[PDB]
Write a protein that binds this ligand. Structure first.
Ligand SMILES: NC(=O)C1=CN([C@@H]2O[C@H](COP(=O)(O)OP(=O)(O)OC[C@H]3O[C@@H](n4cnc5c(N)ncnc54)[C@H](O)[C@@H]3O)[C@@H](O)[C@H]2O)C=CC1
Ligand SMILES: Cc1cc2nc3c(=O)[nH]c(=O)nc-3n(C[C@H](O)[C@H](O)[C@H](O)COP(=O)(O)O)c2cc1C
Ligand code: SF4
Ligand code: SF4
Ligand code: SF4
Ligand code: FES
Ligand code: FES
Ligand SMILES: [K+]
Lengths: 263, 213, 430, 44
């Protein structure tokens, strides 16, 4: 067995070579915070939320991208890892809009939850925030691009899984904008899964828009019937009425996606 | 100064654009500089060639480059919005690029910017009504010992004064082309008061060749 | 040897730096370029890499990595993929205008450097990523590359050594980020110039996925002069781990802003007073010096008196060597305005890929724009220090580090001028 | 007769907008055959 031995917070875990640091911490049940890493998209390494300390090495590494080497001691809860997480969360909330009440992603937002868990509790930002032009990519995805944190799960989805290549980053710097650069309509058969994998409220479900809110939704784990694939879904109801259909993770049918007919 | 496209009557995918056949020869020569299967590597020189033919990029040059290289249009849109040379609006024929970073600002490029603003009658970003001149304010152009300097479409005009850039703009309005260099007494990059180095002739080939070569 | 500087005209690698001689083949052959190149190439990669590791040549791009150890990462067996040398000719750094001079005035030295370096690493060809603003330099280098092909010096049967080596020039499109090696690779691949993450270092996955070395024009062009003159000769200039000669760009507030070649550990006061004709107003008019281009922290007059212009002494002087591009600033300088415009540069040239640079560099520019007017209170200086320390070390490439460093140098050496700016703002507006 | 007084680099005063690419077309025959990845693009 060509497994190599590493350490996660001192605890020895065995990994196949080529294992990322994030997966080495997943193999002891610790989830490193992340925004741009998605386990079915390719690795981008461009939110820097997974910056974790390797001891006897004076620089935090991007755990989503970094393959482990032999004998590392990964420090997920050390001081400079927490300073990295708090600083990166401060830059993510520097120009994010105060839209948490009028946002559908509230209650089921990644940015809110790991701002609460791994971020600070106040702002040092004293300037005016940016504002981004909204886009019309169709009747299914409500686009409010001020909330976008540029994690590029859009482009990796529509370049790898959807195979469409309509999305990209136009511009440069803080004015870089995820979009299509034209009034072009993103209608794939899988086009609604960018509502799933957007960690923020930049891409929301326009039919589900403004109607409900996740903590009061009752989750019911059911099956698709819209085709013969049998996608596993959540039919989430609120007080006796169907609100939306989310996917379930089933590793052998619909890995964590559904078609737009299903959704 | 925006990073989206809105279809005007003068910028749409039905705006006429196509290469001359010598530009198709040049595009084949560009694509031959890159390995097979990496035809997408030649987005930048072919789109730059489209700018050299048209003066600026409508969204038909981007789509034509995406058609001939068999890449998506979005991947050419990313390139044309990423870089500060791909002019996505029709600039004037002389594109005055004044450098205003810290080494040019220490040697008073602001006087040159004010002199161009009062000599042309425009400000930063605008275009003169004859559509010959467009003045924008750019970052470091890499001529720092020859600061302050400008760039006019291809050419560095260096070691400038306000009077030197007035004189260059005057001989541009006469329809000629000036000499792309410094406007002080020196030639390229030597000390202005005289040669502090390289005074002697070179030694020729073979000087100091170690034993065994 | 304890005294450094006073580099003589015979030990200059970049003879014809000034364009005073013929840059073409008939001039470059009269100066030592393309002499015994066949006997350099026939002696294998191992002898070339031994002479470069002998010569103590570090990274002339600015980071200062040991060049021969870097090039030996390509000295590895072939696994189907070709190998490439890539020559970093972007040169977007404020203060830095020397590789423009190497391309424009000694181009055959660069082409012979491409040939010897690609032979040292088994590289198939050479992509020279020149800046798109350097159009005359690019046509100039393509003329010299045509002269090298028509003489049979490169290409099929390079210099009669039986090696095949093309030399390409790829023009940029106006992005300072495409001088970083992986963003440059992406700019060759027809994509946005967004830097990759390391590892993979380009010796494993570089341009087009091939093994690749990206080196500066200066540390490529001085390599045939090293392989001709020997390693220990070039190692006998400058201090130890500071071996050799260096092109300095003494810009800013001097009487003669110039590009000159000097020994590696020359004093800064001696360099400014000996080649640039001194600071405008004498040495008693100096205020600060940005020693090696914009990404290095400034240092005041009390440090620039005794400091040496190499890697180790400037790291001990809490800055970096960098590109060795000297920016001289006198007492008539609004220095906070200068550093704020430099941060404005580093947000107009920043590709927006990862979070800390994309947001924090714009946020530092807004804080510095309020510091120029004084529209702040003195907690925000330490706040800006913590912002810069959160950008530093948390990015993908060192543009975040190279943007946090001018802020840290400015705060560290000129906190009281910021504080008195803010307090006179507070008295005159309230 | 040696000359350390004149700027010999005067050839770039007459360059045109198509100079670089005319030089690339003039060099397109001096170059080795490009290596292949076997496929026409990574989407083939
Ligand atoms: N010359 C110019 O115009 C400019 C130069 N710079 C300089 O660039 C410096 C930053 O350099 P960077 O490219 O960001 O990185 P640098 O820290 O990593 O590394 C230098 C070189 O060594 C290689 N390298 C480093 N560590 C390695 C390892 N463990 N294994 C294999 N290869 C390794 C890298 O690939 C790179 O080519 C700044 O400090 C500044 O001085 C910055 C801007 C402009
Ligand atoms: C933002 C950024 C810009 C850079 N720009 C250049 C450049 O324009 N030219 C250059 O030679 N190196 C540049 N570098 C340094 C390169 O990454 C690399 O270290 C160098 O080109 C080759 O290494 P060397 O110093 O051994 O030559 C830049 C680095 C960064 C982080
Ligand atoms: S995306 Fe998240 S953090 Fe942003 S407004 Fe919505 S709930 Fe709040
Ligand atoms: S819209 Fe959402 S998924 Fe797309 S890049 Fe922005 S934050 Fe990521
Ligand atoms: S730190 Fe800045 S320059 Fe580097 S990859 Fe990120 S956006 Fe780009
Ligand atoms: S998760 Fe590793 S950087 Fe985004
Ligand atoms: S600062 Fe203007 S050219 Fe470099
Ligand atoms: K979402």
């Amino acid at each position: 067995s060509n497994l190599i031995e590493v350490f996660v917070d001192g605890q020895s875990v065995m990994v196949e070579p080529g294992t990322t640091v994030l997966q080495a911490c997943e193999k002891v049940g610790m989830q490193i915070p992340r925004f741009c890493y998605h386990e079915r998209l390719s690795v981008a390494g461009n939110c820097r939320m997974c910056l974790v300390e390797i001891e006897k090495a004076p620089k935090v590494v991007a755990a989503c991208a970094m393959p482990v080497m032999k004998g590392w001691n990964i420090l997920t809860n050390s001081e400079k890892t927490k300073k990295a997480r708090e600083g990166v969360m401060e830059f993510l909330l520097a120009n994010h809009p105060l839209d948490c009440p009028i946002c559908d992603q509230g209650g089921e937002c990644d940015l809110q939850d790991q701002s609460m868990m791994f971020g600070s509790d106040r702002s040092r930002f004293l300037e005016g925030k940016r504002a981004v032009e909204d886009k019309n990519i169709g009747p299914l995805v409500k686009t409010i691009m001020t909330r976008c944190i540029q994690c590029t799960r859009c482009i990796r989805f529509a370049s790898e899984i959807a195979g469409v290549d309509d999305l990209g980053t136009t511009g440069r710097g803080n004015d870089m904008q995820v979009g299509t650069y034209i009034e072009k309509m993103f209608m794939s058969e899988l086009s609604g899964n960018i509502i799933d994998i957007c960690p923020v409220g930049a891409l929301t479900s326009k039919p589900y828009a403004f109607t409900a809110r996740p903590w009061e939704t009752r989750k019911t784990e059911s099956i698709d019937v819209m085709d013969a694939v049998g996608s596993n879904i959540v039919v989430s109801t609120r007080t006796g009425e169907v609100m939306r259909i989310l996917p379930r993770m089933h590793e052998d049918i619909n890995e964590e996606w559904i078609s737009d007919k299903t959704r | 100064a925006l990073f989206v496209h809105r279809d005007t009557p003068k910028n749409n995918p039905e705006t006429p654009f196509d290469f001359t056949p010598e530009n198709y020869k040049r595009i084949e020569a560009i694509v031959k500089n890159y390995p097979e299967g990496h035809k997408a590597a030649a987005v930048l020189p072919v789109l730059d060639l489209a700018q050299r033919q048209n003066g600026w990029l409508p969204i038909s040059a981007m789509n034509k480059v995406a058609e001939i290289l068999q890449v998506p249009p979005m991947r050419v849109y990313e390139v044309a919005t990423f870089y500060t040379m791909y002019n996505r609006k029709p600039v004037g024929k002389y594109h005055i690029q004044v450098c205003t970073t810290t080494p040019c600002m220490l040697r008073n490029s602001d006087s040159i910017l004010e002199a161009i603003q009062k000599k042309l009658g425009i400000k930063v970003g605008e275009t003169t009504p004859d559509k010959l001149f467009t003045l924008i304010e750019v970052e470091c152009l890499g001529a720092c010992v020859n600061a302050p300097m400008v760039q006019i479409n291809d050419n560095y005009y260096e070691d400038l004064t306000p009077k030197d850039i007035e004189e260059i703009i005057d001989e541009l309005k006469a329809g000629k082309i000036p000499k792309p260099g410094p406007r002080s007494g020196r030639f390229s990059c030597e000390p202005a008061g005289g040669l502090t180095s390289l005074t002697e002739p070179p030694k020729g080939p073979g000087f100091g060749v170690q034993a065994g070569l | 040897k304890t005294s450094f500087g006073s580099l003589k005209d015979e030990d200059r690698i970049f003879t014809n730096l000034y364009g005073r001689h013929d840059w073409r083949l008939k001039g470059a052959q009269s100066r030592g370029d393309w002499y015994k190149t066949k006997e350099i190439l026939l002696k294998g990669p191992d002898w070339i890499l031994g002479e470069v590791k002998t010569s103590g040549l570090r990274g002339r791009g600015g980071a200062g990595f040991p060049t021969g150890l870097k090039w030996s990462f390509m000295n590895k067996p072939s696994d189907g993929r070709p190998k490439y040398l890539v020559v970093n000719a972007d040169e977007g750094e404020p203060g830095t205008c020397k590789d423009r001079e190497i391309i424009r005035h000694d181009p055959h030295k660069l082409v012979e450097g491409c040939l010897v370096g690609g032979r040292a690493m088994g590289a198939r060809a050479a992509y020279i990523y020149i800046r798109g603003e350097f159009y005359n330099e690019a046509s100039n280098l393509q003329v010299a590359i045509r002269e090298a092909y028509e003489a049979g010096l490169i290409g099929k049967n390079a210099c009669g050594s039986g090696y095949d080596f093309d030399v390409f020039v790829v023009r940029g499109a106006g992005a300072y980020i495409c001088g970083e090696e992986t963003a440059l690779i992406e700019s060759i691949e027809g994509k946005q110039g967004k830097p990759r993450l390391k590892p993979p270092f380009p010796a494993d996955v570089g341009v087009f996925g091939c093994p690749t070395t990206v080196a500066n024009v200066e540390t490529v062009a001085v390599s045939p002069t090293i392989c001709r003159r020997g390693g220990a000769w070039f190692a006998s200039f400058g201090r130890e781990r500071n071996s050799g000669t260096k092109l300095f760009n003494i810009s800013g507030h001097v009487n003669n802003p110039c590009t000159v070649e000097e020994e590696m550990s020359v004093p800064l006061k001696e360099l400014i007073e000996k080649h640039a004709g001194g600071v405008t107003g004498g040495w008693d008019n100096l205020l600060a010096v940005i020693p090696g281009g914009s990404s290095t922290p400034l240092i005041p007059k009390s440090v620039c008196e005794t400091v040496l212009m190499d890697f180790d002494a400037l790291i001990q002087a809490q800055t970096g060597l960098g590109t060795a591009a000297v920016i001289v600033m006198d007492r008539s300088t609004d220095i906070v305005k200068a550093i704020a415009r430099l941060i404005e540069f580093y947000k107009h040239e920043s590709c927006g890929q990862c979070t800390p640079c994309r947001e924090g560099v714009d946020w530092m520019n807004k804080v510095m724009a309020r510091f120029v007017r004084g529209d702040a209170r003195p907690a925000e200086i330490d706040s800006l220090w913590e912002i810069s320390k959160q950008i530093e070390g948390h990015t993908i490439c060192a543009l975040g580090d190279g943007a946090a460093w001018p802020v840290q140098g400015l705060i560290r050496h000129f906190r009281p001028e910021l504080e008195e700016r803010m307090q006179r703002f507070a008295q005159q507006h309230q | 007769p040696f000359d350390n007084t004149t700027y010999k680099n005067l050839q770039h005063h007459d360059y045109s907008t198509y100079t670089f690419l005319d030089l690339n077309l003039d060099l397109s025959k001096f170059r080795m055959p490009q290596p292949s990845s076997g496929r026409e693009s990574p989407r083939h």
